[PDB]
Each structure stands twice: as structure tokens, then as C-alpha cells.
Amino acid sequence: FIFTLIAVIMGLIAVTATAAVAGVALHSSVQSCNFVNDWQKNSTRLWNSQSSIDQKLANQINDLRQTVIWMGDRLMSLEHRFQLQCDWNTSDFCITPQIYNESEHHWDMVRRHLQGREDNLTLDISKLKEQIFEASKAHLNLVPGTEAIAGVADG
Amino acid sequence: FIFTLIAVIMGLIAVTATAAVAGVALHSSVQSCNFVNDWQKNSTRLWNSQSSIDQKLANQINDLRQTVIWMGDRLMSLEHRFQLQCDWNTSDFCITPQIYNESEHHWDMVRRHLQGREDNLTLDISKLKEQIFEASKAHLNLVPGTEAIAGVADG
Amino acid sequence: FIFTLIAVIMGLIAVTATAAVAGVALHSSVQSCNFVNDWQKNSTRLWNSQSSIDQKLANQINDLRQTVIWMGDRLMSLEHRFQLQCDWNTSDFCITPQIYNESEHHWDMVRRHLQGREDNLTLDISKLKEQIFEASKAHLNLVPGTEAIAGVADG
Amino acid sequence: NYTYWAYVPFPPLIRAVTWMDNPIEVYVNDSVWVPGPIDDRCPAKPEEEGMMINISIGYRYPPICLGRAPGCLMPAVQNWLVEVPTVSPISRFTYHMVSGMSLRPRVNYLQDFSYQRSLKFRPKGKPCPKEIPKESKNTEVLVWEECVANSAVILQNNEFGTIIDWAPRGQFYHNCSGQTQSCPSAQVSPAVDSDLTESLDKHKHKKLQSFYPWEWGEKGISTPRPKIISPVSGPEHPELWRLTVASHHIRIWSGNQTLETRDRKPFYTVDLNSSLTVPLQSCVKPPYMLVVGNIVIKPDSQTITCENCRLLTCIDSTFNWQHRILLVRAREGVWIPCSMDRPWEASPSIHILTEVLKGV
Amino acid sequence: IDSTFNWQHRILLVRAREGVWIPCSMDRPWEASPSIHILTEVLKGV
Numbered sequence: 001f002i003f004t005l006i007a008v009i010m011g012l013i014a015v016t017a018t019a020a021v022a023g024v025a026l027h028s029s030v031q032s033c034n035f036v037n038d039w040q041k042n043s044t045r046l047w048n049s050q051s052s053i054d055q056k057l058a059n060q061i062n063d064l065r066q067t068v069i070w071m072g073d074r075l076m077s078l079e080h081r082f083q084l085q086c087d088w089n090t091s092d093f094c095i096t097p098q099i100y101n102e103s104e105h106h107w108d109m110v111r112r113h114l115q116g117r118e119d120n121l122t123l124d125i126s127k128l129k130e131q132i133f134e135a136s137k138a139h140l141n142l143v144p145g146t147e148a149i150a151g152v153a154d155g
Numbered sequence: 156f157i158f159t160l161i162a163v164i165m166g167l168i169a170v171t172a173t174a175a176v177a178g179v180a181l182h183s184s185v186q187s188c189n190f191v192n193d194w195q196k197n198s199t200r201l202w203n204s205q206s207s208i209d210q211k212l213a214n215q216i217n218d219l220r221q222t223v224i225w226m227g228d229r230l231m232s233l234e235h236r237f238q239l240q241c242d243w244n245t246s247d248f249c250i251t252p253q254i255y256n257e258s259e260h261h262w263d264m265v266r267r268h269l270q271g272r273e274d275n276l277t278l279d280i281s282k283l284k285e286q287i288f289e290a291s292k293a294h295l296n297l298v299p300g301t302e303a304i305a306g307v308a309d310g
Numbered sequence: 311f312i313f314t315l316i317a318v319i320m321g322l323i324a325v326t327a328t329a330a331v332a333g334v335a336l337h338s339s340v341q342s343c344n345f346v347n348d349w350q351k352n353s354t355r356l357w358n359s360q361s362s363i364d365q366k367l368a369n370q371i372n373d374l375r376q377t378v379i380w381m382g383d384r385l386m387s388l389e390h391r392f393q394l395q396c397d398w399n400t401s402d403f404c405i406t407p408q409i410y411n412e413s414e415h416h417w418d419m420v421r422r423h424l425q426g427r428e429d430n431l432t433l434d435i436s437k438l439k440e441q442i443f444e445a446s447k448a449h450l451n452l453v454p455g456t457e458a459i460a461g462v463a464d465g
Numbered sequence: 466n467y468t469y470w471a472y473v474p475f476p477p478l479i480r481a482v483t484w485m486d487n488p489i490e491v492y493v494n495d496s497v498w499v500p501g502p503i504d505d506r507c508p509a510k511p512e513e514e515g516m517m518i519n520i521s522i523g524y525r526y527p528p529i530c531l532g533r534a535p536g537c538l539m540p541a542v543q544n545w546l547v548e549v550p551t552v553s554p555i556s557r558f559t560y561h562m563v564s565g566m567s568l569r570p571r572v573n574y575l576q577d578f579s580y581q582r583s584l585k586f587r588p589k590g591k592p593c594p595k596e597i598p599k600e601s602k603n604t605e606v607l608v609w610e611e612c613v614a615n616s617a618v619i620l621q622n623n624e625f626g627t628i629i630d631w632a633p634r635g636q637f638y639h640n641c642s643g644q645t646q647s648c649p650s651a652q653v654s655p656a657v658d659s660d661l662t663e664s665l666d667k668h669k670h671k672k673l674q675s676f677y678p679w680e681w682g683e684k685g686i687s688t689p690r691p692k693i694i695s696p697v698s699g700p701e702h703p704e705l706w707r708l709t710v711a712s713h714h715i716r717i718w719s720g721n722q723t724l725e726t727r728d729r730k731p732f733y734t735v736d737l738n739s740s741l742t743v744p745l746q747s748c749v750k751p752p753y754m755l756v757v758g759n760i761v762i763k764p765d766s767q768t769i770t771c772e773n774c775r776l777l778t779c780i781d782s783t784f785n786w787q788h789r790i791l792l793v794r795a796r797e798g799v800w801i802p803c804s805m806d807r808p809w810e811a812s813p814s815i816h817i818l819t820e821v822l823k824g825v
Numbered sequence: 826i827d828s829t830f831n832w833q834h835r836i837l838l839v840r841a842r843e844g845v846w847i848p849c850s851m852d853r854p855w856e857a858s859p860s861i862h863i864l865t866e867v868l869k870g871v
């Protein structure tokens with residue numbers, strides 16, 4: 001939960017500041033998944049390249065409450081990620097088979113969620129996660145579509 | 156480890172009470188996998204739809220022992236789930252390729268395990284997990300069977 | 311993080327001592343992945359067969375710092391494994407598509423890493439993990455090679 | 466095109482640390498004068514410090530900000546005094562004082578600029594001593610110990626929330642109970658902000674002279690532990706003072722109180738002199754960072770905005786208090802729609818069969 | 826619990842249970858992937 005990263009291409013500061021310019025367009029409208037991929041690419045690399053917990057700093061911690069709460073969030077996030085159904089061509093992040101409606105989730109709610117708000121005008125994550133769970137079953141998505149089977153079976 | 160779930164279809168009480176009727180049949184004999192799927196469907200949906208840890212309740216915790224023990228159980232379970240081999244058609248829970256014997260595991264032991272017992276007449280989970288581990292290797296199960304290969308190769 | 315394993319084929323002492331003879335050859339040169347598989351086989355089986363946390367021993371723990379540090383390392387290891395690209399035929403451990411160079415990583419660095427060192431002559435895991443992350447994308451490895459596609463379309 | 470919901474576990478976003486968070490770790494590089502945790506190393510990426518960024522984020526609970534702006538806690542000098550009784554007729558005490566940048570209490574403008582006090586939410590803990598210890602030991606070593614004051618000081622009381630602190634604050638005063646009407650009731654601070662900035666090599670002298678003996682109160686070598694009590698109740702944050710104390714040098718004083726006679730009446734003089742300052746460094750570690758600049762907090766919309774702020778990890782004496790400091794952390798996973806040029810697929814199995822047919 | 830509680834009843838403290846193992850019956854043998862299932866669909870559409 002605490003790491004000293006000397007030999008990495010980019011630190012946390014450079015990752016945050018360099019991506020902020022592309023984050024302006026991400027807050028305004030829907031981008032392509034290639035745009036999203038390039039925006040989170042360096043952040044994902046940094047959080048997959050830490051070696052071990054810095055023992056010199058970790059053994060000095062007195063109050064463990066903030067660390068345990070942080071670890072509970074990461075454990076909960078990993079449990080949910082293990083259950084998600086993702087497109088094969090992207091591995092840095094998960095693209096679910098749930099179609100964006102824009103009549104149920106207007107962009108203002110998405111923009112509020114991207115800013116870290118939790119008011120009643122923000123996108124409701126718990127409600128969204130329930131819809132995605134009951135639409136990403138392996139018996140509805142793993143088998144390719146009817147047109148796809150007939151598309152390649154020509155020859 | 157602590158969540159406030161207001162915007163969910165069902166709470167923990169409704170999930171537990173509604174499933175108890177089907178749990179009577181589950182304790183008596185082997186059921187089909189569709190019966191098992193319908194029994195755990197709402198519980199799995201609930202535990203995949205929490206958004207974030209309630210900070211108002213989390214920052215008040217004084218003794219962290221019970222929370223850390225609970226998180227250690229969750230981490231151990233997630234580590235074991237990552238190693239399991241599961242049938243492609245069911246994603247809510249994992250169906251292993253290990254065949255139930257009933258000459259080694261009588262149903263009384265299974266019923267005692269479902270009730271939450273740990274006496275010497277209960278199913279031995281550590282012994283069972285070793286058996287499943289050394290029979291679910293990717294080099295023994297990933298490649299379809301000889302009959303399946305010959306079955307589709309007719310045309 | 312604390313388990314009492316009576317009903318297992320091998321304990322931690324037997325796993326460590328029995329594998330030490332094959333660990334001598336592992337420290338001297340590159341071995342085949344089958345040799346590596348047989349070396350770690352019993353250790354992986356033991357760490358996938360624990361049933362539950364021993365509550366009699368867990369409720370007595372006073373200082374939680376060491377336990378939380380151990381769980382943080384386990385959680386970070388699981389997060390990194392979730393994004394690793396592995397060969398299909400080996401499931402006990404992960405073989406990445408990153409080719410060993412031996413002009414960038416001399417065997418002396420690998421041997422020092424296997425002994426548990428962290429000096430400046432040791433293999434740099436953070437640097438290595440960044441190379442593996444940037445070369446194991448799904449859009450570079452999931453689709454089989456050009457010769458493999460042409461090597462099967464003969465019939 | 467086909468737009469789908471995507472989950473990004475590690476976005477390059479940040480969120481503000483709030484008063485409802487539990488305390489975080491701030492590392493100082495000098496363990497002689499300041500308690501732990503200690504880290505003497507420089508930041509891992511010294512060439513990344515001060516990278517510019519524009520920030521426009523929201524919050525649910527009031528963010529933790531330091532500086533001179535609405536919603537941020539003002540810094541000011543605090544003094545800690547060690548009193549050693551002296552068995553002599555001329556000199557009654559010897560003093561060892563430490564001055565550093567700390568959190569500023571709100572001022573009672575109704576009275577002679579006393580501190581605004583509160584008695585709500587008194588915490589469990591050892592009370593502050595009302596009497597000077599009679600057994601001095603290791604005067605060269607300063608011992609920091611948590612202490613609960615008789616009353617809390619108010620650091621903020623406005624539309625951004627109410628922040629109170631139960632750690633003691635020390636000043637020089639006169640008892641004035643049982644005395645004639647000439648006993649002054651004003652509190653005196655021995656060191657001011659300019660004592661930490663204007664000169665560092667120059668010797669500093671402070672002289673306090675009056676007809677009444679000088680008392681130090683409230684006693685206790687204890688650091689601020691602020692907490693929000695309105696509109697939400699959060700935990701104490703004993704690490705915020707570590708950030709402000711590194712923004713300036715800390716000054717170390719020595720001196721005494723002596724008794725003489727003036728106009729045939731007793732006269733008490735407190736002399737304090739300093740020729741020593743210590744520079745400090747305070748840092749946070751990933752996933753935590755500091756945002757430094759013209760930070761604006763708007764509570765009506767619950768928005769934090771800044772143009773041309775810099776991202777930092779460490780605070781030292783080069784810091785300029787015309788800027789504010791906002792504590793931030795790397796954000797958790799987010800959900801966002803993104804569009805594709807083809808429909809969602811689970812596997813490339815059908816894709817693979819396409820090149821087999823075309824290969825033939 | 827509030828003051829409407831009746832002490833002719835008892836209170837037992839419970840928690841949601843951890844994972845369990847259960848025998849399960851299927852109508853066809855265990856499969857790892859639908860790859861054979863996909864190839865059958867292709868040949869039946871030709």
C-alpha cells in the first residue's frame with residue numbers, strides 16, 4: 001500500500017499532469033475507446049510495475065485505519081473486476097457488452113461522475129452495476145451473434 | 156467491508172429470506188445446475204453492485220481485528236477462485252470438472268457442510284480442494300475430448 | 311493469513327525441504343518450463359488447499375502491522391496477476407510472451423533475484439514488469455502468428 | 466458506431482482528501498526535533514516536482530486545504546516551552562523554547578485578541594499538566610506527548626464547516642486573581658512570524674518585563690489534532706501540522722526568568738535568545754500528492770478549481786504562503802462510455818476463422 | 826433494535842456466509858470453451 005518507485009519511466013506526478021490535457025475532451029463528450037485507451041495507458045503501466053512494499057516506510061505506520069479502508073476498496077474492486085465480461089481486443093481496461101443509452105444516462109451525469117461527485121444528479125454506480133451484471137451473462141454473450149455465424153460460413 | 160446500499164433492487168434481508176425456501180431442497184439431495192443458479196442469482200447480484208465504502212461508518216471503527224480477519228478470508232477466496240477451472244456456460248459461479256463420487260462423499264457430509272459445521276462427519280474442504288487442484292490442469296481439460304473432436308468432424 | 315492445515319498431503323516444511331534439491335539446478339542455469347513446473351507443483355497445491363482462517367489463533371493477534379503488510383503484498387500480487395498474459399497449456403504458473411534476452415539480463419542477476427537480494431547487481435523487477443506490460447497487449451498476442459495461420463490452412 | 470460502458474480501474478485522475486478521511490502519513494527528514502514517521506530520502510522523481518496542471522473536481526465532504534483563502538486553514542507560529550525550576554534568588558526558571566509554523570486559532574475580536582474556544586466533543590486522553598514538573602531530565606531532548614487541553618481552540622467556523630482542536634496552545638500571561646487592578650490580563654506570544662522568516666543567521670532576542678511574574682499556559686508539548694464537527698463529524702488529523710512546520714525554519718530559544726526590584730516593587734523579566742534554526746522537509750508518498758497554487762473552493766456547488774497549480778510531493782522552506790496546499794490522492798476506478806467501430810466480441814474465435822478461409 | 830422490541834423473543838447474531846461447495850448436475854459433459862459449439866453452428870448454417 002506504500003511503494004518507493006525509483007526505476008519507472010513515469011512517476012505519479014507525471015502521469016497525472018500529462019493526461020490532464022486529454023482529460024478535458026473526456027469530460028465534454030463520448031470519445032472512442034482508442035482515445036480512452038491512450039489516455040489511461042501510462043497510469044495502468046505505473047500501477048502494474050511496482051515491485052514490493054517499502055518496508056522502511058511501512059513499519060513506521062501507527063494508525064492503520066486509512067490503510068485498511070484503502071485495501072478494502074482495492075479488494076472490492078478486484079472482486080468486481082473478476083466477474084466482468086470484457087472485449088477480447090482491449091486488456092488494459094474492460095469494455096462491457098452493455099450499450100450506452102443516453103436516454104437513461106445523460107452526459108451531465110457521466111461528467112459529474114468523472115469529477116468525483118456523489119450528489120443526486122450524478123450517475124448511480126450501484127444501479128448501473130446491477131444492469132451490467134444481469135446483461136453480461138456468459139450464456140448471452142460468449143456465443144457470437146446469428147449474423148456473425150452466417151457471415152463467415154459463406155465459404 | 157462496510158457499505159450503505161440504498162439504490163439496489165434487493166437488500167441482504169430480502170436475499171436471505173427469499174432463497175431459504177429453495178434452500179430446503181438444496182439440503183436434501185443433489186439438484187441440477189440450473190436450480191443452483193436460480194438459488195444464488197440474487198445474492199451474487201447484490202455482492203457485485205456495491206459502489207464504495209461508507210466513509211461515515213468506516214472512520215469510526217476502533218478495533219480492526221474483525222475487519223482484517225474478514226478481509227483475509229475474502230483475499231484467500233479470491234486467490235483460490237483465480238486458480239479454478241470453470242465451465243464456460245456458467246459465469247455467476249464456478250463449475251469444476253471434478254466428478255462427484257458419492258462413494259467418497261456421502262450426501263450427509265455435504266448437508267453438514269451446507270449447515271456450517273466443521274465436525275469430523277463434515278465434508279473435508281482441504282482434502283477436496285487438493286483433489287480438484289490435481290485434476291483440473293489446463294493440459295487435461297482445455298483440449299476437448301476425442302469423441303467431441305470426432306463428433307463435429309463428420310462434415 | 312493464519313491457517314492450521316492438518317488434512318493436507320504435505321506441510322510447509324516438507325514442501326520447502328523436498329524442493330531444495332531441484333532448486334540447486336534452478337540457481338545455476340535456465341531450465342525447461344517442465345522442470346520449473348515440477349519444482350513448484352507441491353507448493354502451489356499447498357497454497358490452494360487451505361479451508362479457512364484459524365479463528366482460535368487469529369482472535370489473539372495484538373499488533374496487526376505485520377499481518378496488514380503481508381495482506382497488502384498478497385493483494386498487490388493478485389492485482390498484477392490479473393493483467394498477466396499466460397500460455398494456455400500451463401495454469402499452475404504464468405508463462406508470459408516476453409522473450410528472455412540474456413544480453414540485457416545476465417544469469418547472475420537472475421540468480422541473485424532467486425536468492426532474495428535487492429542490490430544494484432540484482433534483476434530489476436519494476437523495469438522488467440514495465441517491459442512485459444508493454445509487450446503483452448491483447449492486440450499483439452491473442453491473434454496467432456502469420457505462419458501459424460498459413461501452417462494449418464493446408465487442408 | 467457502437468458505444469459501450471467501460472470500467473477503468475486505474476484512471477490518471479485525482480480526488481481531494483477530505484476531513485472525513487482518516488489521517489495519512491507525512492514524513493519528515495529530521496528525527497531530532499520532530500516525532501516520526503521519518504524519511505530522509507529525496508523524492509523518487511525530483512525532476513517531476515512542480516509540473517503544472519489545471520484542476521476542476523468535486524467533493525462530497527469538505528476538502529483539507531492549507532493557506533489563506535476561504536475553506537483553507539491559516540498557518541501561524543506556535544511556541545512550545547520547557548520550564549526548569551531554578552533554586553536561586555535571582556533566577557527562578559530556565560527555558561527551552563521551540564517555534565514553528567502551525568495552525569492558527571480564530572481570534573476573539575471582542576476581547577484583547579484572545580482565542581475563540583469550544584467545549585464540544587471532548588476526547589479521552591491524558592489532561593495537560595497544570596503545574597510545572599519538579600524533576601527536569603534531558604533538557605537538550607524535547608519529548609512530544611499527546612495532551613488534551615481544558616478547552617478546544619476553534620480553527621474555522623463558517624459555511625465551509627467548523628474545525629476545532631483540543632491540543633493545548635501556550636502563551637505568556639499573568640494570573641491576576643487576588644491581585645490589584647494593575648495586573649494586565651493580555652496574553653503574550655513570545656515569537657511571531659517574522660522570527661522564522663526575516664533573519665536566520667542574525668541573533669534574536671525577546672525581553673518581557675512586568676511587575677507580575679510570567680506564567681506559561683496552556684502547558685504541554687503537544688501538536689495540533691484538528692477535527693471537523695460540523696456539518697459532519699470526522700476523526701482527528703495530527704499530521705496536518707507536519708506540512709506547515711516544514712514551510713519555514715524552526716527556531717530554538719533559550720533563556721530564563723529573573724526577579725529584581727523596580728520602584729521598590731518586585732519586577733520580573735523574561736529573556737529569550739536564539740541563534741539556531743533547523744530546516745526541515747515534509748513529504749507524502751504515492752498514491753498521495755499535494756496541489757499548490759491559487760486553489761478556489763466553492764461550497765455552494767461543492768467544486769474545487771485551480772488554474773496553473775503545481776503538483777508536488779515535498780514541502781520545504783522555499784515554500785511561498787501566497788499559494789494554498791490541497792491534499793489529493795489517486796482516484797479509484799471509474800466508469801465511462803466509449804465507442805467502437807464494430808460490435809462487442811468475447812473472443813477472436815470467429816476472427817481467427819476469417820484468416821484461415823482467406824489463407825486458403 | 827428499538828423500544829418496540831418484545832423480550833419474549835431472543836436475538837441471535839448472524840453474518841452472511843462465505844463460499845460453499847455443492848455437487849451439481851448437468852445434462853452434458855463439462856466443457857472449457859464453446860469453441861466446438863461454435864464450429865457446430867458454422868457447419869449447420871452452410
Ligand SMILES: *[C@@H]1O[C@H](CO)[C@@H](O[C@@H]2O[C@H](CO)[C@@H](O[C@@H]3O[C@H](CO[C@H]4O[C@H](CO)[C@@H](O)[C@H](O)[C@@H]4O)[C@@H](O)[C@H](O[C@H]4O[C@H](CO)[C@@H](O)[C@H](O)[C@@H]4O)[C@@H]3O)[C@H](O)[C@H]2NC(C)=O)[C@H](O)[C@H]1NC(C)=O
Binds near residue numbers: 494495746782783
Ligand atoms: C532536511 O531537508 C531540508 C530541506 O532540504 C534540509 O535543509 C537544507 O540543509 C542544508 C544543510 O544544512 C542547507 O544548506 C546550507 O545552506 C547555506 C548556504 O547555502 C546557500 O548558499 C549557497 C551558495 O550559493 C547556495 O548554493 C545554496 O543554494 C544556498 O542558497 C549554509 O548554511 C550551509 O553551507 C554549508 O556548506 C557549505 C558547503 O557547500 C559551506 O561553504 C558552508 O560553510 C557550510 O558548511 C549549507 O549549504 C540547505 O539550505 C537546506 N535546504 C533548504 C533550507 O531548503 C535539511 O538539512 C534536512 N535535514 C536533515 C537531512 O537532517
Ligand SMILES: *[C@@H]1O[C@H](CO[C@@H]2O[C@@H](C)[C@@H](O)[C@@H](O)[C@@H]2O)[C@@H](O[C@@H]2O[C@H](CO)[C@@H](O[C@@H]3O[C@H](CO)[C@@H](O)[C@H](O)[C@@H]3O)[C@H](O)[C@H]2NC(C)=O)[C@H](O)[C@H]1NC(C)=O
Binds near residue numbers: 104
Ligand atoms: C433507454 O432509456 C429509456 C428511458 O429510460 C427511462 O428513464 C431512465 C432515467 C430510467 O428511469 C428508466 O427506467 C426509464 O425507463 C428507455 O425507454 C423507456 O422504456 C420503458 C420500458 O419500455 C418505458 O416504460 C413504459 O411505460 C409504460 C408503463 O409504465 C408503458 O408504455 C410500457 O409498458 C413501458 O413499461 C418508458 O416509457 C421509456 N421511456 C421513454 C422516455 O421512452 C429505453 O428503453 C432505453 N433504451 C434501451 C433499453 O435500449
Ligand SMILES: *[C@@H]1O[C@H](CO[C@@H]2O[C@@H](C)[C@@H](O)[C@@H](O)[C@@H]2O)[C@@H](O[C@@H]2O[C@H](CO)[C@@H](O[C@@H]3O[C@H](CO)[C@@H](O)[C@H](O)[C@@H]3O)[C@H](O)[C@H]2NC(C)=O)[C@H](O)[C@H]1NC(C)=O
Binds near residue numbers: 256
Ligand atoms: C469413489 O470412491 C470410492 C471409495 O473411496 C474410498 O472411501 C473414501 C471415503 C476415501 O477414503 C477413498 O480414498 C477410498 O478409496 C473409490 O473406490 C476405491 O478405490 C480405491 C482405489 O482403486 C480402492 O483401493 C484399493 O485397495 C486395495 C489396496 O489397498 C486394492 O484392491 C487396490 O489396489 C486399490 O488400491 C478402494 O478399495 C475402493 N473402495 C471401494 C469402496 O470401492 C472409487 O475409486 C471412487 N470413484 C472414482 C474415482 O471414480
Ligand SMILES: *[C@@H]1O[C@H](CO[C@@H]2O[C@@H](C)[C@@H](O)[C@@H](O)[C@@H]2O)[C@@H](O[C@@H]2O[C@H](CO)[C@@H](O[C@@H]3O[C@H](CO)[C@@H](O)[C@H](O)[C@@H]3O)[C@H](O)[C@H]2NC(C)=O)[C@H](O)[C@H]1NC(C)=O
Binds near residue numbers: 414
Ligand atoms: C537484448 O539486449 C541488448 C542489450 O541491451 C542493452 O543492455 C541492457 C542492460 C539495457 O541497458 C538495454 O537498454 C541496452 O540496450 C539489445 O541490444 C541493444 O539494442 C539497442 C537498441 O537497438 C542498441 O542501442 C543502439 O544505440 C545507438 C544509439 O545510442 C544506435 O546504434 C542505435 O540507434 C540503437 O539505439 C544497443 O546498442 C544494443 N546493445 C548491444 C550490446 O548490442 C538488444 O536489442 C536486446 N535484444 C532484443 C530486444 O531482441
Ligand SMILES: *[C@@H]1O[C@H](CO)[C@@H](O[C@@H]2O[C@H](CO)[C@@H](O[C@@H]3O[C@H](CO)[C@@H](O)[C@H](O)[C@@H]3O)[C@H](O)[C@H]2NC(C)=O)[C@H](O)[C@H]1NC(C)=O
Binds near residue numbers: 009018019
Ligand atoms: C504516456 O507516456 C508516453 C511515453 O511513454 C508519452 O509519449 C511520448 O510523448 C512525447 C511528447 O509528445 C513524445 O515526444 C515527441 O517526440 C518527437 C520529437 O522527438 C515529436 O513528435 C514531439 O515534439 C515530441 O517531443 C514521445 O515520442 C512519446 N513517446 C512514445 C510515444 O513512446 C505520452 O505522451 C504519455 N501520455 C499520457 C496521456 O500521459
Ligand SMILES: *[C@@H]1O[C@H](CO)[C@@H](O[C@@H]2O[C@H](CO)[C@@H](O[C@@H]3O[C@H](CO)[C@@H](O)[C@H](O)[C@@H]3O)[C@H](O)[C@H]2NC(C)=O)[C@H](O)[C@H]1NC(C)=O
Binds near residue numbers: 807
Ligand atoms: C484491436 O485493436 C488494435 C489496436 O488498436 C487495432 O489495430 C488498429 O487498427 C486500426 C484500423 O485499421 C488502425 O488504424 C489505422 O491505421 C493506419 C495507420 O497508418 C491507417 O490505415 C489509418 O489512418 C488508421 O489509423 C490502427 O493503426 C491499428 N493499431 C495498431 C496498434 O495496430 C485492431 O484493428 C483491433 N482489432 C479488432 C477491432 O478486431
Ligand SMILES: *[C@@H]1O[C@H](CO)[C@@H](O[C@@H]2O[C@H](CO)[C@@H](O[C@@H]3O[C@H](CO)[C@@H](O)[C@H](O)[C@@H]3O)[C@H](O)[C@H]2NC(C)=O)[C@H](O)[C@H]1NC(C)=O
Binds near residue numbers: 164173174194197
Ligand atoms: C430473485 O429476485 C427476483 C427479482 O429480481 C425474484 O423474481 C421475482 O419473483 C416474484 C415472485 O415469484 C415474481 O412475481 C410474480 O409476478 C407475477 C404477477 O402476476 C406472478 O407470476 C406471480 O404471482 C408473482 O407475483 C417476479 O416476477 C419475479 N421477478 C422477475 C422474474 O424478474 C426471485 O424470486 C428472487 N429469487 C430468490 C431465490 O431470491
Ligand SMILES: *[C@@H]1O[C@H](CO)[C@@H](O[C@@H]2O[C@H](CO)[C@@H](O[C@@H]3O[C@H](CO)[C@@H](O)[C@H](O)[C@@H]3O)[C@H](O)[C@H]2NC(C)=O)[C@H](O)[C@H]1NC(C)=O
Binds near residue numbers: 139
Ligand atoms: C447455457 O445455459 C443456458 C441458460 O441456462 C441454456 O439455455 C437453456 O437451454 C435449455 C435447454 O434447451 C432451455 O430449457 C428449455 O427451454 C424451453 C422453454 O420453453 C423448453 O424447450 C423446455 O421446457 C426447457 O425449459 C432453457 O430455456 C434455456 N435457457 C435460456 C435462459 O435461454 C443453454 O442451453 C446452455 N448451453 C449449453 C449447455 O451449451
Ligand SMILES: *[C@@H]1O[C@H](CO)[C@@H](O[C@@H]2O[C@H](CO)[C@@H](O[C@@H]3O[C@H](CO)[C@@H](O)[C@H](O)[C@@H]3O)[C@H](O)[C@H]2NC(C)=O)[C@H](O)[C@H]1NC(C)=O
Binds near residue numbers: 328349350352
Ligand atoms: C511433490 O509431492 C509428490 C507427492 O505428492 C512427490 O512425488 C513422490 O515422490 C516419491 C519419491 O520420489 C515417489 O516415491 C517413489 O515411488 C516409486 C515406487 O512407488 C519409486 O520410483 C521410488 O522407489 C519411490 O518410492 C512417489 O511415488 C511420488 N508420488 C507421486 C508421484 O504421486 C514429489 O517428490 C514432490 N516433489 C517436490 C519437488 O517436492
Ligand SMILES: *[C@@H]1O[C@H](CO)[C@@H](O[C@@H]2O[C@H](CO)[C@@H](O[C@@H]3O[C@H](CO)[C@@H](O)[C@H](O)[C@@H]3O)[C@H](O)[C@H]2NC(C)=O)[C@H](O)[C@H]1NC(C)=O
Binds near residue numbers: 294
Ligand atoms: C501441454 O503440457 C502437457 C503436459 O506437460 C504436454 O504433454 C506432454 O507431452 C510431451 C511431449 O510429447 C510428453 O513427453 C513424452 O512422453 C512420452 C513418455 O513416455 C514419450 O513419448 C517421450 O519420451 C516424452 O517424454 C509428456 O509425457 C506429456 N506429458 C503429459 C503429462 O501428458 C503437452 O505436450 C503440452 N502441449 C503443448 C505443448 O501443446
Ligand SMILES: *[C@@H]1O[C@H](CO)[C@@H](O[C@@H]2O[C@H](CO)[C@@H](O)[C@H](O)[C@H]2NC(C)=O)[C@H](O)[C@H]1NC(C)=O
Binds near residue numbers: 519772773
Ligand atoms: C490551464 O488553463 C490555462 C488557461 O486556460 C491555459 O493557459 C493557456 O495556454 C495556452 C496554450 O496552452 C495559451 O495559448 C493561452 O494564452 C493560455 N491562457 C489562457 C487561455 O488564458 C493552460 O495551458 C492550461 N494548462 C496547463 C497549465 O497545464
Ligand SMILES: *[C@@H]1O[C@H](CO)[C@@H](O[C@@H]2O[C@H](CO)[C@@H](O)[C@H](O)[C@H]2NC(C)=O)[C@H](O)[C@H]1NC(C)=O
Binds near residue numbers: 640642
Ligand atoms: C492563580 O493562582 C491561584 C492561587 O492564588 C490558583 O489557585 C486558584 O485559586 C483561586 C482563588 O482562591 C481558586 O478559586 C481556584 O479554584 C484555584 N485553582 C486551583 C486549581 O486550585 C489558580 O489556579 C491560578 N490560576 C492560573 C490560571 O494559573
Ligand SMILES: *[C@@H]1O[C@H](CO)[C@@H](O[C@@H]2O[C@H](CO)[C@@H](O)[C@H](O)[C@H]2NC(C)=O)[C@H](O)[C@H]1NC(C)=O
Binds near residue numbers: 555720723736737738
Ligand atoms: C538570563 O538570560 C539572559 C539573556 O540571555 C542572560 O544575559 C546574558 O548573559 C550572557 C552570559 O554572561 C551574556 O553573554 C549575554 O550578553 C547576556 N545577554 C543579555 C541580553 O544581556 C542572563 O545572564 C541570564 N541570567 C541568568 C542565567 O541568571
Ligand SMILES: *[C@@H]1O[C@H](CO)[C@@H](O[C@@H]2O[C@H](CO)[C@@H](O)[C@H](O)[C@H]2NC(C)=O)[C@H](O)[C@H]1NC(C)=O
Binds near residue numbers: 718741
Ligand atoms: C542564548 O545565549 C546564551 C548565552 O547567553 C547561549 O549559551 C552559550 O552558547 C555559547 C555558544 O554555543 C556557548 O559557548 C556557551 O557556553 C553558552 N553558555 C553561556 C553561559 O555563555 C545560548 O546558546 C543562546 N541560545 C540559543 C538558542 O542560541
Ligand SMILES: *[C@@H]1O[C@H](CO)[C@@H](O)[C@H](O)[C@H]1NC(C)=O
Binds near residue numbers: 121
Ligand atoms: C437533489 O436533492 C435536492 C435536495 O435539496 C433537491 O432539491 C433536488 O431536486 C434533487 N435533485 C434530483 C432528485 O434530481
Ligand SMILES: *[C@@H]1O[C@H](CO)[C@@H](O)[C@H](O)[C@H]1NC(C)=O
Binds near residue numbers: 275276
Ligand atoms: C468423531 O470424533 C468423535 C469424538 O468423540 C468420535 O467418537 C467419532 O467416532 C468420530 N467420528 C468419525 C471419526 O467419523
